[PDB]
Amino acid sequence: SQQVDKIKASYPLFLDQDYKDMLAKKRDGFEEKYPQDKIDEVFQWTTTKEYQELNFQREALTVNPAKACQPLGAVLCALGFEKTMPYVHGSQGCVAYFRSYFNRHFREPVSCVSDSMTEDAAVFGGQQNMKDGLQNCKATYKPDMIAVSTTCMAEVIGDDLNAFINNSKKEGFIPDEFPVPFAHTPSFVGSHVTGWDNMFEGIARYFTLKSMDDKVVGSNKKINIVPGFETYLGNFRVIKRMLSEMGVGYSLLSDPEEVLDTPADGQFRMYAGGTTQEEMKDAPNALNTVLLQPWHLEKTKKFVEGTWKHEVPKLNIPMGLDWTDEFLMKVSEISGQPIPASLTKERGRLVDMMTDSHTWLHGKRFALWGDPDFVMGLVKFLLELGCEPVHILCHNGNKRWKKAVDAILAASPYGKNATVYIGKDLWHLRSLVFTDKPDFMIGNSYGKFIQRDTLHKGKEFEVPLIRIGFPIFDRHHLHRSTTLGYEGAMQILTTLVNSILERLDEETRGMQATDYNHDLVR
């Protein structure tokens, strides 16, 4: 039933007595469902130390992973260049998924094509699909550039991207000077951050490999910035703002900030802004190249050190105070510009915030996950705050990264109770937050399922989710946030101390029971 003045959607509609009664009959009659008694006992068992031991013996099964595959990163990379169409050579199912995935995170259109390789293209190869596809795409959507990556099936069968594209050009499907950079992006290797590294390297090699002869390092007086797989619009914007503020000439290579934030003004723009082809061609002339997220830009770094001959600085991701400081001094060192009074003041305003909030953050325990550089940046900042990371999970992490993060942890009194996990998923993490309960989780939307689980055990075991990372599908416009630099650090500090205060108020909102500590002033 519906009262026309107050229509109910699925919640709370299905709580009406007639639906509830109907669902009771469904279950009893046809579901052959395990008794509630058993379900509760099984549930309780999965929260124990013994279930954790079994759970951590897994060797073949993955449950709720915290990563996606390579071409997702390639697509994001390709999106960052002017009038560029991401083009994924292989099965079209993948593209439908990549677009949907980014649509939901960005609440924006996401442009990308497939060349629709079917069963006969599986056994004969995708040479024809690549010919017809490059021609059709150029004609219909008119990009300046098409950036080609691969699905897993094109990789199993070894479709030679370089040859397929050269024959397309040789046979007149697209003009020879029409730029078609490529990168093999196999999904069964690494993860989506690895796909970003691979795609960027293809494009950079495409524009600079032939013509190294006339390049002189330092001759355009600018600093190359490579951001890596990045999904906070504010992150592109803050790097650009701090460099402009210092007077540093800079060149952001892969810049999707504009095209992922177009205005609603009556027209759809498939393309907007981004790194130009001329900027890439000119990149080897820069003073140096800074990699924002080095732990997934290793292939890019070898090409840039080897072919461009830049002394790429050893910098951590510029998150939190020390590493933002370190980033700014090194940009200062490369370019000759001193650090302006305006950035120095901003630094002291983040310090002021740390001093103001330290009593509430101190000793607070967090479980967290995400991509390698993000996680280590977030871990470093939690330590600078007097917080205790407890469970650090990075599913797409490696042994060397794990070694670096264990060193940061051990350098501080606040890391004594923390352990780093690589190769482990969100079902592992779920066990950890039941057996060794932290105060909060910091991760993406997928963590809401953990929070629901911890709550089902009991309100005193509930571990709230703090949404920082990618993808965030169940809040709106968090993709406009910042995590880098001083600006990112202020936002994170504010998100953290206020999650802490929001939770405390909930635990103290009980009339004449807990509200003696329901303070007006915190």
């Binding site: 079917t118 069963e119 006969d120 599986a122 056994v123 004969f124 190869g125």
Partner: protein, 272 residues
């Protein structure tokens, strides 16, 4: 019951030739037979049909759009002795995935009821090197139950006979597939027959038959037909009849015991 056999062996050892000749003799005995080529080139049925095998399943499917659009009638042809012929097809060398071509093709035959005849025998002629799961599709459950490995007195063939057996063991265990025997296609190596009999023993099988090297085979091949048809009176035509009845009457089905590269060498040394 219908009997399914898969023919394996070193590249160039004479599988297709032996298979088609074995099958012609079977048809000549009054058996109802189907041949399934699992090789990207389309030569497995060419001596039964009297011309190249132009319409492979993959080619017809690509032309029709998808295999789902394809008719069984468009790919199944009958030749000498009423023998049914079909080819998987696949790419030319160096692109695509010939393994998937076989997987696709076998699945097509199953879906279109290619086995739902009164067939007495189905023979799968398979590629030399079994490089992937697709080329072992012929020996999964409900496919071949008998395997014959065509070899010779030469080093390369016996190493290959042994290596293929390693691959067989995995399928024999989870299925009913068994090694039936070795067919020795002579290269005129000295004491050739003794050597293959010996190799057969260490594995646990027999040497089913010795097929001599006879230039009549190549004359018939140039005429695009089997020896059984090219020269029914020939001595070689009798060699294939012999092989046929032995496979027909064969009951020895084993899971092979692969030997070590050392044993294989000491064996060559013991006979040569």
């Amino acid at each position: 019951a219908m009997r399914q056999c898969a023919i394996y062996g070193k590249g160039g050892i004479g599988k297709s030739t032996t298979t088609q000749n074995l099958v012609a003799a079977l048809a000549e005995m009054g058996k109802k037979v189907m041949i399934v080529g699992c090789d990207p080139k389309a030569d497995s049925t060419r001596l039964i049909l009297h011309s190249k095998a132009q319409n492979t399943i993959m080619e017809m499917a690509a032309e029709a759009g998808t295999v789902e659009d394809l008719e069984l009638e468009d790919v199944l042809k009958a030749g000498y002795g009423g023998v049914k012929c079909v080819e998987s097809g696949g790419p030319e060398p160096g692109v695509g995935c010939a393994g998937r071509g076989v997987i696709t093709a076998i699945n097509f035959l199953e879906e279109e009821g290619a086995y739902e005849d009164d067939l007495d025998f189905v023979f799968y002629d398979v590629l030399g090197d079994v490089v992937c799961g697709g080329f072992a599709m012929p020996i999964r459950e409900n496919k071949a139950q008998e395997i014959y490995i065509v070899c010779s007195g030469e080093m390369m063939a016996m190493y290959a006979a042994n290596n293929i057996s390693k691959g067989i063991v995995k399928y024999a265990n989870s299925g009913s597939v068994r090694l039936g025997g070795l067919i020795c296609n002579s290269r005129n190596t000295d004491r050739e027959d003794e050597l293959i009999i010996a190799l057969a023993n260490k594995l646990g099988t027999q040497m089913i038959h010795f097929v001599p090297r006879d230039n009549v085979v190549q004359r018939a091949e140039i005429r695009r037909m089997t020896v059984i048809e090219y020269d029914p009176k020939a001595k070689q035509a009798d060699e294939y009849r012999a092989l046929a009845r032995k496979v027909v009457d064969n009951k020895l089905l084993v899971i092979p015991n692969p030997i070590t590269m050392d044993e294989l060498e000491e064996l060559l040394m013991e006979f040569g």
